[PDB]
Amino acid sequence: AADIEGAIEDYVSSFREEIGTVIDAGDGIAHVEGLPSVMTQELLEFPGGVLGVALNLDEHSVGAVILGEFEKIEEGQQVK
Amino acid sequence: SAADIEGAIEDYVSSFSADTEREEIGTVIDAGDGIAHVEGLPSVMTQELLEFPGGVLGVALNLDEHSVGAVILGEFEKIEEGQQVKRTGEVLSVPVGDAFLGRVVNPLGQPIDGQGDIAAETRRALELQAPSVVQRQSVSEPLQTGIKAIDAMTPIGRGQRQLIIGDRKTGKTAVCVDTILNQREAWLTGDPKQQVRCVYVAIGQKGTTIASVKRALEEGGAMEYTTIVAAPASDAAGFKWLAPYTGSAIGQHWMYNGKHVLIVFDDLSKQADAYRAISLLLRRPPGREAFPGDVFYLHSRLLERCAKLSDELGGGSMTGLPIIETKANDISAFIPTNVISITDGQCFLESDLFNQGVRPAINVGVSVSRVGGAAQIKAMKEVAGSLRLDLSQYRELEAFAAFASDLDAASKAQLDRGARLVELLKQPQYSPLAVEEQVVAIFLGTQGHLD
Amino acid sequence: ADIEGAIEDYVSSFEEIGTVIDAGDGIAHVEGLPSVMTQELLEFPGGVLGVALNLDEHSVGAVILGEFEKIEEGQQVK
Amino acid sequence: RAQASGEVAQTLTQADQQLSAQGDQVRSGLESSVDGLSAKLASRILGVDV
Amino acid sequence: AQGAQQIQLMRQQLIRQLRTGLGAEAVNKAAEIVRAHVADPQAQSATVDRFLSELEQMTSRLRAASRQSLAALVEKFDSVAGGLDADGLTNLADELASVAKLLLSETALNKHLAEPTDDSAPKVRLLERLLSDKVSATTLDLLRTAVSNRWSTESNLIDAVEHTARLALLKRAEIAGEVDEVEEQLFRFGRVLDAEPRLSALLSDYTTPAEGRVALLDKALVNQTAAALLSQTVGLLRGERADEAVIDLAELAVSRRGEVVAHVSAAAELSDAQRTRLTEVLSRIYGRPVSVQLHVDPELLGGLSITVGDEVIDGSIASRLAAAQTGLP
Amino acid sequence: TAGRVVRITGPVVDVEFPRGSVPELFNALHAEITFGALAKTLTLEVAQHLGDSLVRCISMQPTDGLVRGVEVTDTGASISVPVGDGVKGHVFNALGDCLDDPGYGKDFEHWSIHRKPPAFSDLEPRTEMLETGLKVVDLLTPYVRGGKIALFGGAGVGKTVLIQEMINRIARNFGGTSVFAGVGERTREGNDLWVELADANVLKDTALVFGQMDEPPGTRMRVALSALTMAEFFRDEQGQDVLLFIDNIFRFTQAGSEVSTLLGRMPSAVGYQPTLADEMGELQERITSTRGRSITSMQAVYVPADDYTDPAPATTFAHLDATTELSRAVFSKGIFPAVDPLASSSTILDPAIVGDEHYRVAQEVIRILQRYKDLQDIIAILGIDELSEEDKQLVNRARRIERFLSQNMMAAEQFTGQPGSTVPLKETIEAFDKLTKGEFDHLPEQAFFLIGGLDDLAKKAESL
Amino acid sequence: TAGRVVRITGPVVDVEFPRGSVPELFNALHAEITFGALAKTLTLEVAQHLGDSLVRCISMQPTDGLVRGVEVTDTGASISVPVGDGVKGHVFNALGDCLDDPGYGKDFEHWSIHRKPPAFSDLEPRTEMLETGLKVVDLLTPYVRGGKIALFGGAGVGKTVLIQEMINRIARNFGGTSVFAGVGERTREGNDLWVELADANVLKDTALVFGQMDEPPGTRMRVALSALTMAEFFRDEQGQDVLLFIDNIFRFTQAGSEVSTLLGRMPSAVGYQPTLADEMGELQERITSTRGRSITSMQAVYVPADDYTDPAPATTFAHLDATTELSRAVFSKGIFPAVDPLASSSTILDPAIVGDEHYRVAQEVIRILQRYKDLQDIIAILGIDELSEEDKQLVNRARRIERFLSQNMMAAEQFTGQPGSTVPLKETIEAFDKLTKGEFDHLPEQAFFLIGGLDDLAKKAESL
């Protein structure tokens, strides 16, 4: 039992620049997985020269709203 | 007698044949309240008819990654989890043909009048798309209703949609049953261009109201040419949702063959309430007023599929008289204002007019017919060519001058003319005037002979 | 055949305590308590009582009566 | 209207008596025909001679 | 005129209800004739022969990420099995069931370990720490790819580990040459747990301690491979119907041979002379090798009925009686 | 082998069965509650199949004390209620157990409460006018013998005083048999009715079925179907003309909404169930007169918050041959029976059915009251005198007509102490003909309150 | 390489693709329907990426007969429609297929439906007055040549008759090109336009795109963008001045609301999609005219339940230069064209642009009609003779101004029988400058109703 708690703590503590990837996009929102050190309201940049605000952070994804030209976003785009 | 009775069954037995071809089977995995979810069926189409084992049919409305959201069209009491479901190989369709004239049918096109089986001409899919802009023609020949307050002031043409909107108990079914009855003097000619066929789609009526309408049509001879599509309120929201499309498909078959058709939908507010029930049991998110989002695309897809066709399509037509019940006499309500915008005119039957002796009770201000003087014979365009504007200005002036101590010589003359026109447009039920009597009746009013 | 029937009876033959698995704003959910009755009065460690309303497949949805501020995750419920 | 309704009620009684006599007469032949019809159908349901 | 039409419709309803009555009497007599005729075994053999001759003339449940990750996991299991042996494979399957129990219980560990991520190295390092002493290295080598891939849900990791433990156990039957035996026992257990509705609903014990169900199987229910498969499956049952799970084990076991199972219904005892032709025509129809799960029953008397995949071909005295009786005017 | 309870959610109980043994819809399922003072056998009705052999059931008793995992036995048939001539004179709950003596009726023929409504081939329209002897009803809302009748109203306007009036008007002299469904109304009224029918000696020919307020929503809805099943047997097998009073049929759709929010079906408009018009339809269509055999229904329909647009009143309005819309406004004037003349209606108020004179009089009264209600917006500000003379002449007789639609009812004696009155249809038409022609404008408005017919109007005018 | 359908739920279809082959947003996908009379190629637009290589799509044609696991091929580009001089005098659907002659557009230059609106650097405000010859429009709501005009109105208040009159007034003399978009409009009025433009020979310069209300939410959305991307070709690539009629522009946002729940967006206030102001803005901003190249938009906006507080009307009002605003109140008085004089507004109505002689008169008419609407409550209850001599004179002017804003329109030949009229702007200002100073108080109130200017007012007054 106790070994799983120590190992999960060491996994979460284990968390150049950080990379995410888009997993969902629709209607002006793009959910980004990864970016473990992202902060709420951080400007994300997407590879087309697009920006998003990282306005929501979930357990495994970052709900970034998109500031313009949203049609240029796709699933699997590398987010810095 | 006996030789035909035995011979028909001998031809049936001789025709009976093996069903040893394959079919796909699903199994019901959830069922209740009139819905079922069917597991399997890897190849079922959207809006395919499904055969459940109790004889009962359903329609595959949702297709998920591993489940099919079927609506049951019948007695869902016999549906339970684990029993097999066969696909039909058929998009949602009903039988159609001349054999429907004079019958009362389910929204599956099977009889409930208790007479024999219907010798259907073909199946028709319920979702065949409307005739496009290049296939239609200008509405230019009239349906005589026999009602002065309509034919002179909100005229109905072949290929019109005229919304008989009103409050409860204001004569909406009386206007439409009178319209269907009036077609007998044209039917008896046997001429396919004058001859109008009728369909009366009863949605959520009580069964004795449908039997009252049926005998009112039998007394006037209208069951010679009228089909009743009865979804009485006893049956599940599947039938109550579907009934307008079964009426519309039965109508469309005569229309495309070059016949003239009249459809009455009684009532579309109860089809909208049945489609809400069906959608909320399928758990789609409600939109406004708890209706589904696409409650507009229920009524537009229903009503827009009736219009006068081009001469390149036999020149047939279908005329819709949808009915709507306005809860507390508000015309500015969600479902009312959808159907008012889908249709080509209103006959707003005000319950306050109906009580003060003005029957048929048409609220001449709000009611309109946007085809206007194309849906009238020349003589009616002469004698009545502004009569709605004269009567709405009269109701405005009569509201304004209701408390003036005195009036101008012309204001007095208008307020005393309007009272002649309103008394002239009163009419007792089952007294249809021929158009040749209506034009003379209106001529007395508009030329001032009644003054 | 008969061995299966008898084995089903033996499995059927085989002071229980549950634990709070959620709490919020006046209600709490309890895991365990397989033998709890609907509308049973439940007692929480702070001397607080609750009413077992929604008995789900794996949880008991209890309304808390009195100081639900004293209720939290992992408290023994009896 | 009342004369025509009396003629229609008389026609309905003459129908009820005619159809009673016909329904008994045709069922007399139908009772014999049913054996031959079922013998034919027992073949068509099996999909072979019987 | 309304009276004249009323008489015509009264006459029409009389000759209609006459035809309904003559039809009902004829169908019910023909049903008695065919039900008597179906009593000879030569008549049943003639009916199944007429159906067989007529037939002669005539991962996909998972979302994309889980499907692709399971295909890649099975592609590595093929490499593990190529150098495996039965004494190694039985240990691999028990150890993979043990980690599937661990993931199923420690749902925090499972939620983290199933995290969909391309830089999966921290998850592999968690698994290395937690498991490297507890379990043999060949299971670790297979769980590295099971964890490094992407899953559509936190369940689909457990579903892949369980399926891999099932594959490793089937491989013993395939190497030893017991595959026909284990298939026959899995269909035997599948039919009995479908005809025994008390014990199989008690075997759906995912609300109870699984070892009680393991002991229940050891007492009530043989090839040690089939017993190991049943015990592994009830341990990992996760609210599936026990009989439907055993049928899905048998479907996987036949699918390992590239074949598919047609369930078959008949009056009784379809002879082997029928079975060889029936397998041959089914193979011609569906373009695959086949196996027949003969579910004989007296209610569906005469003809032959078959079901395979979602589809059916269903020729029986009952099913054709319903077709004749519903078709009355 | 048999099922087990899996989940409990107030009066809704989810139970699983073996793979094959899953019950049909609407089967009665017995379960046991085994705690102390509340130990009871529990009747469950199967409402849905959830899959995995689970079925969701509605409990007909309160579920308090029900444990998860208890055994549940399928009876293999629906809820069944006793029917027979020996059912008359007794009082039953929804489940067909007699309240007076629980051993009674268990040996009778039992009918399942779930039945298909009569097929359309057997329905015919009913047009024979029912003489009630109430002025406003017989004039403006003529009731239909063998039709459906309803008394709509808010809370405390007199729906149940009208129902216990109509029991004295009709069910006393009516040679047939009466059934009374208590659907979610007061247990106190259920007793004061039962002891009244015992005193009037009407009880010998009526059966009462009660599913009063204190009962859980399962039986508060299934009571209406049980009472209707007793009436369907008197209609069909005994061949009787039936009366079927139902107070209050809004509680049928309310109990349907309560179970629907517990079955977890999505809320409709204002939080009613979906299927509202199908649950109401499936009740209201069984209660119909087939060609050979009449069933005179009469249904008190509550209107919540006096909101006559509420989905339950608005749904039930379609099923009715005569509707008596009782009103707060008319009740505030003290004009009992409180019937709102312009909202109430009957399908038989046509000159082909009531005759030319009765129709002419009823339209003159409705025109007068319509013009008065369309002057009420000026009356409320300025009072009567600021109107034109042609309107002031009208309003003086409109107020006299509005008051002369009141009556001293037979049920009102328990409140007012004054006796009741009966007015025959001929005298009703004659009095309103004289009122609308203006023969009585010289009598004061207080002469017309709570009085039965012209001779009693004269007596009251002399007393002033 | 190609994708496959996974899930189908009304007009929304989910499609799964191989890992590398996921299509970009707003690509057209083709899927085949293979049953009977329904057999068609189906066009889906990619609305979302769901993750796991799934995309959610909206179908441009009915999903009936579509099968799970059918192949789906991506076109590699967005939906595209034919553009060029040769689209004038043809009728198209939302997909850009000609209705009149199938396959006609297939050799043209095709432009993508989706594009960005012009940059803010390219925009300048338009101040040229458009003269229509309608009294109420030219006086109170003067239109902007190159602006975004609108005709708001509830259901049935005659918007389509007014837009057909506006086509007949403007596009008949107009020397440039015209486009008509049919967005969820009634197909009967789409055909009555089509034959009227053929008879008047205007059809040689007009391209019509029709996506009428019998079509699924995918095409009722994309038709407005399709017609607009024909107008944006005539604007940008040819620099020939354009008219762009749109009936009914509300149906764009409504069809968006119908898919939004199936797209898994949460519903907003009164059940719209949340993206409403971002969908509508991304459409409406493209309709603007950049410097040196006008598009004169004329878009009829439906108003749900007549409620001008409804979010769709309330969001649309920002995008417009002149908003004619129809109402059922003015319509119910017979004052067809039913324009509400006080709600309706224009940005060009200022004394810098229209001149003081117009501006003063428009403001005096609005002040009179506003004082008349302040007085209608008093006049209904207390009565006209109670009022001051100045207020009562103003009421007798407002009742004449109300009627003199009504006009016999050329599209209303069928409504009125009399032929239509055009009133020059100078005559409109002179007539209302006389009316507001009382110069016609001696004429009967009826003489102004439906009449085409002063010469016809004189001939009608002397006819009475």
Q: Domain limits of chain F? A: 1-78, 80-347, 349-464
Task: Give the minimum alpha-carbon distance from F39 to chain B in angstroms, rounded to a whole number.
Answer: 31
Strand (E) or helix (H) holding D15: helix D2-46
- CATH number of the domain within which A35 lies: 2.40.30.20
Taking the C-alpha atoms of residue G137 and residue G341, their distance in angstroms, rounded to an integer, is 9
Contacts of B356 (CB under 8 A, 6+ apart): F367, F370, F371, F374
Minimum Cα–Cα distance from A67: chain G residue? G278
* C-alpha to C-alpha distance for F96 and F107, rounded to whole angstroms: 12
Nearest to F277 by CA among F323, F229, F313, F324: F313
**Measured between alpha carbons, how far is B338 from B388 in angstroms, rounded to an integer?**
23
Q: How far apart are CA A20 and CA E148, in angstroms?
A: 17
| Cβ–Cβ under 8 Å, residues E130 and E112 | no
Angle at B85 between CA B82 and CA B90, to 5 degrees: 165
Instruction: Enumerate residues 395 to 454 of chain G having a beta carbon within 8 A of any beta carbon in chain B.
Output: 399, 412-418, 444-446, 449-450
Distance, in Å, from the CA atom of E157 to the CA atom of B196, rounded to the nearest integer, reads 67
Q: Work out the minimum CA distance from A31 to partner chain G, whole angstroms.
A: 9
**Claim to verify: residue B28 and residue B102 sit in the same structural domain:** no
Is F185 a catalytic site residue? yes
Rounded to whole angstroms, how far apart are CA atoms B301 and B292?
Answer: 15
By residue range, what is the domain housing residue B70? 1-94
DSSP three-state, residue B50: strand
Closest CA to G211 of G203, G201, G221: G221
Strands G129-130 and G143-144: antiparallel
Measured between beta carbons, which residues in chain A are less than 8 angstroms from residue G263?
Answer: 26-27
Please give the Cα distance from G130 to F72 (Å, whole number): 80
Query: Which chain D residue is nearest to residue B11, measuring alpha carbons?
Result: D37
Q: Which 8-state DSSP code applies to residue F105?
A: T
Query: What CA–CA distance (Å, rounded) separates G363 from G142?
Result: 13
* Relative orientation angle of helices E242-256 and E179-195, to the nearest 10 degrees: 160
Q: Are F143 and F425 a contacting pair, CB within 8 Å? A: no
Pairing mode of beta strands F295-302, F242-247: parallel
Cβ-based neighbours of F353, under 8 Å, separated by 6 or more: F127, F129
Give the span between the Cα atoms of E45 and E40, in whole angstroms: 9
User: Which residue in this structure is represented by tokens 């040996």?
Assistant: F107
Cβ atoms < 10 Å from Cβ of F458: 14
C57 to chain F: which residues are within 8 Å by CB? 6-7
Residues of chain E contacting B114 with CB distance shorter than 8 Å: 13
Q: How far apart are CA B233 and CA B236, in angstroms?
A: 8
Residue of F118, F306, F113, F297 whose CA lies nearest to F211 = F113
Chain G: residue whose CA lies nearest to B310: G191
CB pairs under 8 A between B and F: 162
CB < 8 Å & 24+ apart, contacts of E202-209: E202/C8, E202/C11, E202/C12, E203/E234, E203/E237, E203/E242, E204/E237, E204/E239, E204/E240, E204/E241, E204/E242, E205/C11, E205/E234, E205/E237, E206/E237, E206/E238, E206/E239, E207/C57, E207/C58
**Which among E19, E54, E327 is the nearest to B5, CB-wise?**
E19
Write out chain B residues lying below 8 Å of D45, CB-based: 16
Cβ separation of E30 and D38 shorter than 8 Å?
A: yes
Inter-CA distances, G65 with B123, F50, F127, Å:
16, 29, 49
8 Å CB contact of E152 and G53: no
Determine the Cα–Cα distance for residues B425 and B439; give it in Å rounded to an integer: 12
Catalytic residue among B370, B395, B417, B420: B370
| CB within 8 Å of F397: residues ≥ 6 apart | F368, F435, F436, F438, F440, F441
Listed by number, the residues of chain B in 150-209 with a beta carbon closer than 8 Å to a beta carbon of chain F are 168-169, 204-209
Question: How many angstroms away from the CA of B20 is the closest CA of chain D?
Answer: 11
- Whole-angstrom distance, CA of residue G150 vs CA of residue G320: 7
Residue bearing tokens 């495994």: A60
Given F18, F52, F53, which is nearest E198 (Cβ)? F18
Q: Which amino acid, G429?
A: I
Which resolution in angstroms does this entry have?
A: 3.3
DSSP code at position B25: E
Cα–Cα distance between E33 and F101 in angstroms, integer? 54
- Enter the tokens of residue A73: 């976003």
Amino acid code (one letter) for F381: I
- Longest Cα separation, chain E: 99
Question: Using an 8 Å Cβ cutoff, are G205 and G177 in contact?
Answer: yes
Q: Is the same domain home to B33 and B112? A: no
Distance from CA of E89 to the nearest CA of C (A): 31
3-state SS of chain G? CCEEEEEEECCEEEEECCCCCCCCCCEEEEEEECCHHHCEEEEEEEEEEEECCEEEEEECCCCCCCECCCEEEEEEEECEEEECHHHCCCEECCCCCECCCCCHHHHCEEEECCCCCCCHHHECCCCCEECCCCHHHHHHCCEECCCEEEEEECCCCCHHHHHHHHHHHHHHHCCCEEEEEEECCCHHHHHHHHHHHHHCCHHHHEEEEEECCCCCHHHHHHHHHHHHHHHHHHHHHHCCCEEEEEECCHHHHHHHHHHHCCCCCCCCHHHCCCCHHHHHHHHHHHHCCECCCCEEEEEEEECHHHCCCCHHHHHHHHHCCEEEEECHHHHHCCCCCCECCCCCEECCCCCCCCCHHHHHHHHHHHHHHHHHHHHHHHHHHCCHHHCCHHHHHHHHHHHHHHHHHCCCCHHHHHHHCCCCCCCCHHHHHHHHHHHHCCCCCCCCHHHHCCCCCHHHHHHHHCCC
Buried b (16+ CB within 10 A) or exposed e, G290-307: beebbbbbbbbbbbbbbb
At residue F287's C-alpha, the angle toward residues F353 and F186, to 5°, is: 110
Beta-carbon-side half-sphere exposure of residue F301 (alpha carbons within 13 Å)? 32
Beta bridge partners of F247: F182, F300
Residues of C numbered 9-68 whose beta carbons fall under 8 angstroms of chain F's beta carbons: which are they?
Answer: 34-39, 53-57
Among G45, G107, G92, G50, which residue's Cα sits nearest to residue G72?
G45
Task: Give the sheet arrangement for strand B317-322, strand by strand.
Answer: B104-105, B226-231, B196-203, B260-266, B317-322
Sign of CA dihedral B433, B436, B439, B444: negative
Interface contact flag, A10 E129, Cβ < 8 Å: yes
Contact E/D (≥3 CB pairs under 8 Å)? yes
Of G10, G7, G5, give the one whose Cα is nearest residue G62.
G10
Q: What is the DSSP letter of B441?
A: H
Do G420 and G410 meet the contact criterion of CB atoms below 8 Å apart?
A: yes
CA torsion angle for F344, F347, F350, F352 (degrees, to 10)?
-160
Mutate to test the interface with E, among C2, C3, C10, C11 (most CBs of E within 10 A): C11
Candidate from B13, B17, B18 with C-beta closest to D37: B13
B194/B273 same-domain check: yes
DSSP letter for E221, please.
-
DSSP E105-117: H-HHHHHHHT---
Taking the Cβ of residue B388 and every Cβ of chain G, the question of whether any pair is shorter than 8 Å is answered with yes
Other CB atoms within 10 Å distance of the CB of residue G149: 28
Looking at beta carbons, which residues of chain B come within 8 Å of F286?
A: 234
Distance from CA of G63 to the nearest CA of E (A): 23
F12, β-bridge pairs: F9, F58
- Is A55 an interface residue toward E (CB < 8 Å)? no
Among F200, F204, F182, F183, smallest CA distance to F191 is for F182
E26 touches chain D (CB under 8 A): yes
Q: How far apart are CA A35 and CA A10, in angstroms?
A: 18
Q: Is the CB of residue D42 less than 8 Å away from at least one CB of chain E?
A: yes
B299 residue type, one letter: H
Rg (CA), chain D: 20
Instruction: Tell me the sheet residues that pair with G3.
Output: G72
Q: Give chain G positions within 8 Å (CB) of F378.
A: 381
Minimum-distance CB partner of D44 among B2, B6, B16: B16
| CA–CA–CA angle G274, G277, G281 (5° rounding) | 140
- D47 and E18: CB-CB below 8 Å? no
Assigned token pair, F122: 């057997």
Residue B111 gets which letter from DSSP?
B
Contact assignment for D38 to E25 by CB distance below 8 Å:
yes
Q: Which two tokens stand for residue B197?
A: 């066929």
Q: Decide: helix, strand or coil at residue B77.
A: helix
> Across-strand partners of B105?
B111, B229
How far is the C-alpha of B51 from the C-alpha of B69, rounded, in Å?
14
CA distance F381 to chain G (A): 8
Instruction: Please judge whether B5 and D30 are an interchain contact, meaning their C-beta atoms are less than 8 angstroms apart.
Output: yes
State residue F3 phi and psi, 5-degree precision. -80, 180
In the numeric block, the tokens 């009179």 are attached to G368
Instruction: State the smallest CA–CA distance between residue E240 and chain B in angstroms.
Output: 13
**Where do we find the tokens 């003199």?**
G404
- Catalytic-residue membership of F126: no
Number of helices and strands in chain A (H, E): 1, 7
E130 vs E138: CA distance, rounded Å: 15
Distance from the Cα of residue B47 to its chain's centroid: 22
Is residue G113 a contact partner of residue G79, using CB atoms and an 8 Å limit? yes
Looking at the DSSP bridge assignments, the partners of residue F339 are F326
Q: Are E80 and E142 in contact (CB under 8 A)?
A: yes
The enclosing H or E element of B35 equals strand B35-39
CB-nearest to B276 from F268, F285, F317 is: F268
**Type of residue at E82:** G
- Cβ separation D25–B2 shorter than 8 A: yes
Closest CA to B267 of B345, B210, B182: B210
Of E41, E56, E35, E51, the C-alpha closest to E264 is E51
CA end-to-end span of chain A: 37
State the best of E188, E199, E221 to mutate against chain C, taking most chain C CBs within 10 Å.
E199
> B13 and B99, same structural domain?
no
- Element housing C54 (H / E): strand C49-55
Q: What is the H or E stretch that residue F103 is in?
A: none
- Strand stretches in B184-313, DSSP E: 196-203, 226-231, 260-266
The HSE-up count of residue C73 (CA atoms within 13 Å, CB side) is 1
Nearest to B71 by CA among G385, G433, B85: B85
Select from E202, E96, E178 the least CA-distant residue to E139.
Answer: E96
G348–chain B nearest CA distance, Å: 31
Contacts of E35 in chain D (CB under 8 A): none
CA-CA distance, G321 to G53, in Å (whole number)? 44
User: For residues E163 and E256, what is the distance between their CA atoms, to the nearest angstrom?
Assistant: 13
List, in sequence order, every beta strand (DSSP E) within F184-334: 206-211, 242-247, 295-302, 322-325
Q: In angstroms, what CA-CA distances link B53 with E328, G37, G55?
A: 17, 28, 36
Distances (CA, A) of E215 to C7, E77, E280: 9, 30, 42
Q: What Cα–Cα distance (Å) separates residue A28 from each residue in B285, G79, G258?
A: 22, 20, 19
For residue G382, list chain F residues with Cβ-Cβ distance below 8 A. Answer: 382
Give which of F19, F50, F54, F74 to mutate to test E binding, by max E Cβ within 10 Å. F19
Beta partners for residue F16, in sequence order: F4, F54
Greatest alpha-carbon pair distance for chain G in Å reads 84
CA D32 to chain centre: 13
Integer Cα distance of B255 and B253 in angstroms: 6
Total domains present in chain C: 1
Reported in sequence order, the residue ranges of F131-226 that DSSP labels E, i.e. its strands, are 143-144, 149-153, 177-183, 206-211
Compute the C-alpha angle G268/G274/G275, nearest 5°: 160
Q: How many whole angstroms separate alpha carbon F159 and alpha carbon F248?
A: 9
In this structure, chain A runs to a length of: 80
Which residue type is seen at A4?
A: I
Using a CB-CB distance cutoff of 8 angstroms, which residues of chain E are in contact with residue B3?
Answer: none
- Asked whether E and B share 3 or more beta-carbon pairs under 8 angstroms, the answer is yes
- Give dist(CA F91, CA F182) in Å, integer: 10
Burial string for G316-338 (b: 16+ CB within 10 Å, else e) reads beebbbbbbbbbbbbbbbbbbbb
Mutation test of the interface with chain A: which of E103, E110, E117, E127, choosing the one with the most A Cβ atoms within 10 A? Answer: E117
Mutation choice for E interface testing from G4, G17, G49, G52 by most E CBs within 10 A: G52
3 state DSSP class of F201: coil
Nearest to F49 among B80, B168, B237 (CB): B80
Q: Do B203 and B80 share a structural domain?
A: no
First-residue to last-residue Cα distance in chain B: 67
